[PDB]
């Protein structure tokens, strides 16, 4: 039989939403600081690039990524959420950062390059979080 299951193909999931008109939203001083200070300083770091967009499991050849990670998050998504005033409070934004870092540690092993990158960025994140208004 000549059906060899070379189709249908894999794919990346739809990325997390960055707009939601019926979601409650505010601008707070903490959320402005999270954009202006926390996100933008992390974004410029040389270890930021793996985290600047949703994981492209196809390009990166990580076909098990979304088998393991069911709540993906990345700083590109977070950056757009802050720019779109998506959040109600600082906690919602911070939980996105926590999710991103947690996904990295779940999927990978201690000592992997990606984990070392996440640890460094997390250490910085936590330092900047302590200067929150
Ligand atoms: C160390 C960078 N390696 S990569 O560009 O192949 C990559 C980018 C983003 C990743 C990963 C992950 C695992 C392994 C490699 C890798 C991963 O969890 N992410 C999202 C932070």
Residue-wise DSSP of the chain: -------S---PPPPPPS--TTS-----HHHHHIIIIIIHHHHHSTT-GGGSS---TTTTT-TTHHHH-SS---HHHHHHHHHTT--SSHHHHHHHHHHHHHHHHHHS-TT-HHHHHHHHHHHHHHHHHTT--
Going by alpha carbons, the residue nearest to atom 3 of ligand 1 is 114
User: d(Cα 19, Cα 23) in Å, to the nearest integer?
Assistant: 8
Ligand 1 site, residue 38, Cβ cutoff 6 A: no
CATH code of the domain occupying 28-132: 1.20.920.10
Method used to determine the 3D structure: X-ray
Domain parsing of the chain, residue ranges: 28-132
Q: What is the resolution of this structure in A?
A: 2.0
Closest-lying ligand 1 atom to the alpha carbon of residue 104: 18
Tell how far the Cα of 28 is from the centroid of ligand 1, in angstroms.
33
For residue 35, give both structure tokens: 């954009």
Location of structure tokens 């930021």: 48
CA-CA-CA-CA torsion sign (80, 50, 89, 36):
negative
């Amino acid at each position: 039989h000549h059906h060899h299951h070379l189709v249908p193909r894999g794919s990346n999931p739809p990325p997390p939403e960055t707009s939601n008109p019926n979601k409650p939203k505010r601008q707070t001083n903490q959320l402005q600081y999270l954009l202006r200070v926390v996100l933008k300083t992390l974004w410029k770091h040389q270890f930021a690039w793996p985290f600047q967009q949703p994981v492209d499991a196809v390009k990166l050849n990580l076909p098990d990524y979304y088998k393991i990670i069911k709540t993906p998050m990345d700083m590109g998504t977070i950056k757009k959420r802050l720019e779109n005033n998506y959040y109600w409070n600082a906690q919602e934004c911070i939980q996105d950062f926590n999710t991103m870092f947690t996904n990295c540690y779940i999927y990978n092993k201690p000592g992997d390059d990606i984990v070392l990158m996440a640890e460094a960025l997390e250490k910085l994140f936590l330092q900047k979080i302590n200067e929150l208004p």
